[PDB]
Amino acid sequence: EYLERGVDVKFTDVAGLGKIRLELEEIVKFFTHGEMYRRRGVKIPGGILLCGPPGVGKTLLAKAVAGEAGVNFFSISASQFVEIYVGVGASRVRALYQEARENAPSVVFIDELDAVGRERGLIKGSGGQERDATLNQLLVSLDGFEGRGEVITIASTNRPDILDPALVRPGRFDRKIFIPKPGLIGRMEILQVHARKKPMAEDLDYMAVASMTDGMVGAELANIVEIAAINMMRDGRTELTTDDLLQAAQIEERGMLDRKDRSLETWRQVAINEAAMAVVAVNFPDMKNIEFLTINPRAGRELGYVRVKMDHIKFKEGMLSRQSILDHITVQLAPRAADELWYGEDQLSTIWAETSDNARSAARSLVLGGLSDKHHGLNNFWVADRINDIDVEALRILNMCYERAKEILGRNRTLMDEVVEKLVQKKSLTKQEFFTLVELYGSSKPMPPSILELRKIKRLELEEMVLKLDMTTARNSS
């Protein structure tokens, strides 16, 4: 009933494994070299749990490790265990573990334990009672009494925090393996292994494609492959090339490109907004690298957009400076000030009503996030005066950033005009031409010194003053 036929997935059919594959072949060793494991006085760990984002191929990983193990494979949905009546689920898991026991050697797979692995006492109902009964039955089948060494369970959950502490107790679910989002090389391998089944060209550098689809799951890479199969009848070309995959990545990243009737002043307004955004984005190190700048309307966003990719390591670790945030608010204050510099204060539009709210939210978050230097951070107080004064600093930072944005914008009026003319004329601008116009019409942008230069100057100053103390002690003593 719960048995499958025709399992042939191996480690070659799955891509982007890394050192996890090593752990995977450990399971193969657990299924092959087990006599040496047992002779060294070691109990076989029967519980492995794969945790990660959905779409990483948890079922594919289970199929691959089952095929490489060379044993019978069981894959069962956990939603079948939950029933409006109580009792059938415990019998189902008992019969499941029994047929797994008699089919030894074998490996079983149970996906989405979050339906049946919830805490006992979070919902008051008969369904919760059935869930508790099934959880206890699987608890007693896994470790409860002696008599199982050859059946190994495989678990695949997206939220490991809902797991019962009874299950993760040593002896039931001890091995925990995280399968993360693919980085760079995993995306190459997944795209290539999904693209073997389609005729493909030899000039196809997937590096740029994966450099566009940063931080996307393997199922999304399969989708990118899927938007590289049909759509070529409109032009009718010969072979799949780089630009087709680049456009497919652009489509799956933002949406379908649609053209509608429009006036000229609307295009001028949108291009002025995008021009302000890009011009202020140029003058800061936090978002200097600009790739695309367009004003074409898309699905869900009539307004234009800009693309920037600074290294994604500081955001994950949280090492962003205060100057990194105070600039960004200025960037989010780029559109409205441009309106004040182009149409007057009496004719402010309502297109920047979203970025201006982002600027004020970022200012409030920076104020109450400990980055403020009013007393020393201290985003919490007791008396009413200091709590009232907390919000005033957000307004002061907002006004300072708005004035800085206004000054920066007034510094670059010629670059403003040239890039806005190019935006209304071409509707899309790449990195090369935009940076060429920035070089032709830009002003001075003195970059503030980084951490290394400040460290070096402070180190030489410290050494010189400590050696000054050295002579002022020595020649005074000698």
Add this chain to the structure above:
Amino acid sequence: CGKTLVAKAIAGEAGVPFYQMAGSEFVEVLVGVGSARIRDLFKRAKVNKPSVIFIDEIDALATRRQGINAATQERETTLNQLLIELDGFDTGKGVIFLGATNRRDLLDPALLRPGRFDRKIRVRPPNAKGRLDILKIHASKVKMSDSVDLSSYASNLPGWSGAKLAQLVQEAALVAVRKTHNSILQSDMDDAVDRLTVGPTRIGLELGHQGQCRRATTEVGVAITSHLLLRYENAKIERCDRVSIIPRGQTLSQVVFHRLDDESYMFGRLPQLLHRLQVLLGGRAAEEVIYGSDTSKASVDYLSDASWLARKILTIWNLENPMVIHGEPPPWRKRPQFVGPRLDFEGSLYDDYDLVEPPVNFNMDDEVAHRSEELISQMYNKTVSLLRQNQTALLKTVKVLLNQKEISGEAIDFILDHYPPQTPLNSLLQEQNPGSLPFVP
């Protein structure tokens, strides 16, 4: 919008078998019948290849497990069977599956994953040209008079689906049958339009003269303020088509407003919003300049919207330039609708775009309240000063609308042309009949 009609068109153009079935037909009392029906339908489609399967109202089966009987278990089992069947499809077998839905939010995201629903096509309501074509198609089936101009009704009915246009044509044919007309006249079209929009007219259900002159004063003042703002400062506002005070449906009075093009509904500038605020305050301005200091409740409703709109000027949009730190949600929410004032100039009036934050400092709140009161009082004073300079035209329009029970925008424009500013009231009061108009449209 004819999603089922579109699927039937695809099946007819392809010349392939078409298996249409509703999702609610898969939901029964006995558990497992729906999964068996799913399997049988997929098997029958696989027998007659190529084929098109169509499931209407798939949200009945694919309802999300919301965290806000055995029917839920049966629905889950049928959805799992559908997922298994869709995942097991080989692409080269030539069977195309279509699922129609009205609420994409209720759908299970598992179905939205690649491999089950690869293409997601949004069937938007038809445009003016599309509504014109749909009206032509539906009027090809019924005897039509040459005086009916379908382009005007296509342009004047935004957001109308093809089914609604078909119902409009059928109701007009029914009206023509009731009026014993040999063909659908333009009057039948107008009657059907008014029946669908504002409802049918009642039979002599009228209140006293006191409670009617007030509604007349409000509607005529709003229309006069809008027309004057169009005439003098060339405001980018709407136009008053017609005003009625006959009860229709659940509304005792109405002002039909012609909807402008959508390209002017995005870049709402400060003068346009201030002029619309003046239009909203024009009703209470008319009550103040006509009925002195004894106003009524019939002008408070507009007084509500203006009292909210200025707030959206100062907090949500941040149009003035002392910058604010947080917005506020609307305490009262009113749906955009028919003959009541537009309040959809930026798509909607009572819909904050998730730009609200809870406050910490309470002094900025009273500063914002003071600024809003100042702006509201200034705009109210401005519209009262504008309306008080034209009293003969306003009173003449009030009397004409009170006599005829209906008036048109061109009649209001003619009243404004025949009554220049600063005319004395004795010119109107010396006429033989104030509620008479010598213009024949």
